[PDB]
């Protein structure tokens, strides 16, 4: 009967707020630093959202004086011996509020300069619904954003800084609740504890933002390959194997519970990519996921001229701005060595090109991984000295990344005109 107490005593503080707030805010921290690669050193910075809300909202029109900006740009990226950051990860959930909109506007103001794509997640309060599962009911989010409720948001999608924000939808289950027959608490070598239950039913037992696995794939897409082509699709990047599902015996026979918050359909995968969101879609029953779309919050536009239309399609694509960013981490990092050496217009075009040259091809290699070694297709690098300043220059590169698959239509038909020898008149 002492078990009856413990099953009440401990279950009183595990269900308690504040206590399970740290759980959420550490389980999803453990999730990131689970892989441990050869050359991918993560790093923490525990800060309340409000302590940054006040920061950017006070220094939106003076970002260089922002305290955070002075702990990522001018601190490690700018300074000599400093080690620059790469792809920040916002563990927060951002709504459609006109306050949280600034939070992104500021963090992106940093990311844009520090060159570090800021990945985050968006709350279910965005689509104006109290249960994220009920987003499936919305037909097309494309027609949704036309609603005047998103006016402030559509303005932000037009900003340049938004080409570095990458917001994710859906939240993966990060902990299985405690049952004796399922996920038993590892008791002690004598203190019988394994017989210990929890208390949940519908949908309210710990979640974590998809942004984790998104970044935790960018890490993967670096130890294996070297660039960030390997974070999309099933066969290529985002697959995310083996997630923490859940099972429960209400009355039937252990009816499984999908690991993901929401079971996105096919046209949901797409109808979100246009809004500038990253859906974390699940394979029904398979207890797995995959990132089909990896788009920034930047507007895609349309345009009449075909070239212009294609430009905006690649810029919105996050996976490229991750790569183009890695060139900035090459320039402002390596060329710093020869800051005093005597060099020319024809010499800087050598050093900068001789490097990137090993990462540009046209031929395709078997398998995705063996080819994702080569992110770019071709590059131009036209540097040129400026008048007045003798020792100063001004470069201007332009990279065309290997355009990813994105979909296709198809019209099948019985022609009966292909082989006229069987249906023709002459016989």
């Amino acid at each position: 009967v002492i078990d009856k107490l413990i099953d009440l005593q401990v279950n009183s503080i595990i269900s308690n707020d504040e206590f399970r707030a740290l759980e959420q805010e550490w389980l999803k921290v453990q999730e990131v630093c689970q892989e441990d690669y050869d050359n991918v050193e993560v790093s923490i910075l525990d800060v309340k959202k409000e302590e940054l809300q006040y920061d950017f909202e006070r220094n939106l029109y003076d970002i260089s004086s922002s305290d955070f900006f002075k702990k990522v740009y001018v601190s490690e990226f700018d300074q000599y011996g400093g080690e620059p950051y790469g792809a920040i990860l916002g563990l927060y959930n951002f709504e459609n509020t006109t306050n949280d909109i600034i939070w992104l506007t500021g963090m992106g103001m940093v990311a844009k300069n520090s060159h570090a794509p800021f990945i985050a997640s968006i709350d279910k309060s965005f689509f104006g619904v109290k249960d994220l599962s009920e987003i499936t009911h919305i037909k097309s989010f494309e027609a949704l954003l036309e609603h005047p409720r998103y006016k402030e948001w559509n303005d932000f999608r037009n900003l340049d800084v938004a080409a570095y924000i990458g917001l994710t939808v859906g939240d993966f289950m990060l902990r299985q609740p405690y049952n004796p027959e399922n996920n038993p608490v590892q008791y002690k070598l004598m203190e019988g504890f394994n017989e210990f239950v929890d208390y949940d039913k519908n949908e309210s037992y710990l979640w974590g933002p998809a942004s984790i696995h998104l970044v935790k794939n960018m890490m993967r897409s670096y130890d294996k390959t070297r660039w960030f082509q390997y974070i999309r699709g099933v066969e290529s990047g985002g697959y995310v194997k083996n997630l923490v599902a859940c099972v429960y015996d209400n009355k039937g026979i252990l009816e499984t519970k999908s690991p993901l918050n929401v079971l996105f359909a096919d046209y949901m995968e797409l109808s979100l990519a246009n809004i500038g969101l990253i859906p974390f879609v699940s394979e029904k029953g398979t207890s797995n996921a995959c990132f089909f779309s990896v788009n920034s919050a930047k507007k895609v536009e349309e345009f009449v001229d075909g070239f212009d239309s294609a430009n905006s399609r690649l810029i919105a694509n996050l996976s490229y701005t991750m790569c183009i960013s890695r060139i900035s981490h090459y320039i402002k990092c390596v060329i710093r060595d020869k800051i005093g050496s005597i060099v020319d217009v024809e010499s800087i075009q050598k050093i900068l090109s001789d490097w990137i040259s090993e990462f540009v091809t046209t031929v395709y290699q078997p398998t995705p991984l063996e080819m994702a070694r080569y992110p770019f297709r071709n590059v131009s690098i036209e540097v040129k000295t400026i008048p007045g300043k003798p020792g100063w220059y001004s470069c201007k590169i332009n990279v065309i990344p290997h355009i990813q698959f994105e979909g296709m239509n198809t019209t099948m038909t019985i022609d009966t005109r292909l082989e006229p020898e069987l249906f023709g008149t002459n016989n």
Binding site: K4, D7, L8, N11, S15, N16, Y199
Partner: peptide, 12 residues
Amino acid sequence: SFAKDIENNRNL
């Protein structure tokens, strides 16, 4: 903020 869901949810 009255916890009439933590107290009502007694369970033995």
